Amino acid sequence: NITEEFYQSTCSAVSKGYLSALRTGWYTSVITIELSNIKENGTDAKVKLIKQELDKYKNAVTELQLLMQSTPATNFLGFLLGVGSAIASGVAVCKVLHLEGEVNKIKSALLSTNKAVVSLSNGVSVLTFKVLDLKNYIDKQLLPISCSISNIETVIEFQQKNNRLLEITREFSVNAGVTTPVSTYMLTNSELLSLINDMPITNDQKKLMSNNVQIVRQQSYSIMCIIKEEVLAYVVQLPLYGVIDTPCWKLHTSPLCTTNTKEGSNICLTRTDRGWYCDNAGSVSFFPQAETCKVQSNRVFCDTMNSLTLPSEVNLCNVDIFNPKYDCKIMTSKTDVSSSVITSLGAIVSCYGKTKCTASNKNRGIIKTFSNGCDYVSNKGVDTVSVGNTLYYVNKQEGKSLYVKGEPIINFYDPLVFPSDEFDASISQVNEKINQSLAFI
Amino acid sequence: NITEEFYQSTCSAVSKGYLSALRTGWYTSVITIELSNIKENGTDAKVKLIKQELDKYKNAVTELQLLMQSTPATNFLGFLLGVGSAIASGVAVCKVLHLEGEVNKIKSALLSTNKAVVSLSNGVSVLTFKVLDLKNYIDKQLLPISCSISNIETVIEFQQKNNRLLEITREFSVNAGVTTPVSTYMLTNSELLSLINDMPITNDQKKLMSNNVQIVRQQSYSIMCIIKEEVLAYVVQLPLYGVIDTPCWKLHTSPLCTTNTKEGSNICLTRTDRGWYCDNAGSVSFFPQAETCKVQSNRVFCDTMNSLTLPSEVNLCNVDIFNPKYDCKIMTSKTDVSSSVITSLGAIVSCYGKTKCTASNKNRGIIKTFSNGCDYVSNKGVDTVSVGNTLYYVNKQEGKSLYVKGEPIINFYDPLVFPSDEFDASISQVNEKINQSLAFI
Amino acid sequence: NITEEFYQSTCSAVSKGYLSALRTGWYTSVITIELSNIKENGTDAKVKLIKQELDKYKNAVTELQLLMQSTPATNFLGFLLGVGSAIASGVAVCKVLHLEGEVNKIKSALLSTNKAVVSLSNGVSVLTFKVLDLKNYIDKQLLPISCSISNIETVIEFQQKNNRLLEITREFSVNAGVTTPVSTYMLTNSELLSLINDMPITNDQKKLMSNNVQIVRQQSYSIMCIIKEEVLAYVVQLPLYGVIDTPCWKLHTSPLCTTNTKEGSNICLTRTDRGWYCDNAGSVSFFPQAETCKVQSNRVFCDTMNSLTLPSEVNLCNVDIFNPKYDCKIMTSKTDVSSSVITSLGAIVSCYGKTKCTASNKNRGIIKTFSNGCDYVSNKGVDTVSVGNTLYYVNKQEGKSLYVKGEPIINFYDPLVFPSDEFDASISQVNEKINQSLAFI
Ligand SMILES: NCc1ccc2c(c1)nc(CN1C(=O)C3(CC3)c3ccc(F)cc31)n2CCCC(F)(F)F
Query: What three-state secondary structure class fits C206?
Result: helix
- Judged by DSSP in three states, B396 sits in coil
Same domain for C208 and C270, yes or no, is: no
Half-sphere exposure of C278 (CA within 13 A, CB side): 29
CB of A156 within 8 A of CB of B156? yes
Say yes or no: C215 and C259 in one domain: no
**Is residue A397 a part of any domain in this protein?**
yes
What lies within 8 Å, CB to CB, of A57 at 6+ separation is A134, A162, A165, A166
Q: Chain B 161-180, CB below 8 Å of chain A: which residues?
A: 170, 172-177
Protein residue with least CA distance to atom 15, ligand 1:
B79
Residue B298 is part of which domain span? 3-21+247-439
Ligand 1: which atom is nearest the Cα of residue C268? 1
Count of Cβ atoms closer than 10 Å to residue C433 Cβ: 18
Residues C263 and C190 in one domain: no
Secondary structure tally for chain C: helices H, strands E: 9, 26
Tell if the CB–CB gap between B173 and A189 is shorter than 8 Å. Answer: yes
Q: Is the Cβ pair A281, C389 closer than 8 Å?
A: yes
CB C252 within 8 A of CB C276: no
Instruction: Give the distance (Å) from ligand 1 centre to CA of residue A294.
Output: 26
Neighbouring subunits of B (3+ Cβ pairs under 8 A): A, C
Of B152, B214, B252, which has the smallest distance from its Cβ to C177's Cβ?
A: B214
Could you tell me which residues come within 8 angstroms of residue C279 by beta carbon, excluding any fewer than 6 positions away? C20, C246, C247, C248, C285, C312
CA nearest ligand 1 atom 32, residue = C76
Torsion from C-alpha of C4, C6, C7, C13, nearest 10 degrees? 70
Element (H, E) at C115: strand C115-119
Question: What is the distance between the alpha carbons of residues C94 and B40, in angstroms, rounded to a whole number?
Answer: 54
Which amino acid is residue A141, in one-letter code?
Q
Question: Is the domain of C349 the same as that of C204?
Answer: no
If asked whether residues A330 and A419 sit together in one domain, one would say yes
Residue C414: partners with Cβ closer than 8 Å, 6 or more residues away: C434
Is A11 inside any structural domain? yes
Which of A240, A263, A287 is the last residue before a domain boundary? A240
Same domain, A90 and A163: yes
Beta bridge partners of C357: C387
Residues 6+ apart with CB under 8 A from A284: A277, A278, A309, A310, A311, A312, A314, A315
Residue A387, CA atoms < 13 Å, CB-side half-sphere? 31
User: Does C397 sit within 8 Å of A71, measured CB to CB?
Assistant: yes
Residue A378 lies in a domain: yes
Are the beta carbons of A213 and B83 separated by less than 8 Å? no
Whether residue C306 is contained in a domain is answered as yes
Give this entry's resolution in angstroms.
2.9
Give the integer Cα–Cα distance in Å for C250 and C294. Answer: 12
Interface touch B354/C327, C-beta < 8 Å: no
B415 touches C306 (CB < 8 A): no
Q: Kindly state if the Cβ of A335 falls inside 6 Å of ligand 1.
A: no
Q: Which of C170, C205, C240 is the C-terminal boundary of a domain? A: C240
| Pairing relationship of beta strands A12-23 and A243-253 according to DSSP bridges | antiparallel
Domain count along chain B: 2
Q: Which whole-number Å values give the CA distances from A312 to A253, A326, A331, C333, in the listed order?
A: 19, 9, 22, 22
| Distance between Cα A279 and ligand 1 center (Å) | 27
Atom of ligand 1 nearest to the CA of C335: 1
Residue type, A240: L
User: Hey, is the C-beta of B338 within 8 angstroms of any chain C C-beta?
Assistant: yes
**Residue B315 CB neighbours (<10 A):** 17
Let me know whether C229 and C273 are in one domain: no
For the Cβ of A424 lying below 6 angstroms from any atom of ligand 1, the answer is yes
**How far apart (Å, rounded) are the C-alpha atoms in residues B96 and C217?**
45
Give a yes or no: residue C245 inside a domain.
Answer: no
* CA separation for the pair B137, A126 (Å, rounded): 45
Judge whether A405 and A8 are in contact, CB under 8 Å.
Answer: yes
| Residue A271 near residue A282, CB atoms below 8 Å | no
The answer to whether C260 and C246 have CB atoms below 8 angstroms apart is: no
* Cβ contact C3:C13 at 8 Å: no
Contact A337 B83 (CB under 8 A): no
Q: Is the CB of C79 under 6 A from ligand 1?
A: yes
- Looking at the structure, do residues B60 and B105 belong to the same domain, yes or no? yes
Is B217 in a helix, a strand, or coil?
Answer: helix
Rounded Cα distance, C297 and A351, in Å: 53
What CA–CA distance (Å, rounded) separates A64 from A225? Answer: 10
| Strand spans (E) along B177-328 | 178-179, 221-228, 231-240, 243-253, 256-257, 268-271, 275-280, 283-287, 294-296, 299-303, 308-311
Q: Looking at ligand 1, which residue's alpha carbon is closest to its atom 4?
A: A424
Q: Is residue A223 part of a domain?
A: yes
- Residue A428, chain C, CB below 8 Å: the answer is yes
**Integer Cα distance of C286 and C280 in angstroms:** 10
Instruction: Tell me how far apart the alpha carbons of residues B208 and B185 are, in angstroms, rounded to a whole number.
Output: 23
Residues in chain A: 441
Q: Which ligand 1 atom is at minimum distance from the Cα of C78?
A: 32
CB contact under 8 A, A156 and C151: no
Tell how strand A299-303 and strand A12-23 pair up. Answer: parallel
**Residue A320 neighbours by CB distance under 10 Å:** 15
- Judge: A252–B83 Cβ closer than 8 Å, yes or no: yes
Residue B421 CB less than 6 A away from ligand 1: no
Cα dihedral C300, C301, C302, C303 in deg (nearest 10): 160
- CA pair distance A117, A97, nearest whole angstrom: 14
**A227, A284: one domain:** no
Q: Is the dihedral of CA B406, B409, B410, B411 positive or negative?
A: positive
Residue B229 burial (C-beta neighbours within 10 Å; 0-12, 13-18, 19+):
exposed
Give the span between the Cα atoms of B241 and B212, in whole angstroms. 12
Last residue of one domain, picked from the residues A205, A240, A275: A240
Q: Which residue owns the Cα nearest ligand 1 atom 7?
A: C423
CA distances from A233 to A59, A136, A229, B335, C203 (A): 17, 17, 11, 50, 32
Which residues are registered as beta bridge partners of C248? C18, C278
B153/C66 CB distance under 8 A: no
In the reported structure, the alpha carbon of residue A79 is separated from the centroid of ligand 1 by a whole-number distance in angstroms of 8
Do residues A267 and A247 touch, judged by C-beta distance below 8 A? Answer: no
Residue nearest to atom 25 of ligand 1 (CA): C423
Between positions 250 and 309 of B, the ones with CB within 8 A of C are 252, 254, 264, 291-292, 294-297, 299
| Partner C, chain A 23-62, Cβ-Cβ below 8 Å | 24-26, 45-46, 49, 52, 59
Whether residues A387 and A351 share a domain: the answer is yes
| Residue nearest atom 2 of ligand 1, based on CA coordinates | C421
One-letter amino acid at A432 equals E
Distance B175 CA to ligand 1 centre (A): 31
Q: How far is the CA of C312 from the centre of ligand 1 (A)?
A: 27
Residue C101 lies in a domain: yes
Residue B341 burial class via C-beta count within 10 angstroms: exposed 0-12, middle 13-18, buried 19 and up: buried
Closest ligand 1 atom, CA of C77?
A: 30
Any domain includes C187: yes
Q: Which helix (H) or strand (E) holds A302?
A: strand A299-303
Counting one residue from chain A and one from chain C, the pairs whose CB atoms sit within 8 A come to 157
Which chain B residues touch A362 with a CB distance below 8 Å?
Answer: 122-124
Whether B219 and B280 map to the same domain: the answer is no
Q: What is the DSSP letter of A288?
A: S
Alpha carbon A157 to chain centroid distance? 37
Residues B292 and B391 in one domain: yes
Pocket mutation for ligand 1, best pick of C270, C329, C423 (most atoms within 8 Å of C-beta) = C423
For residues A202 and A188, give the distance between their C-alpha atoms in angstroms, rounded to a whole number: 22
- What is the SS3 assignment for C177? coil
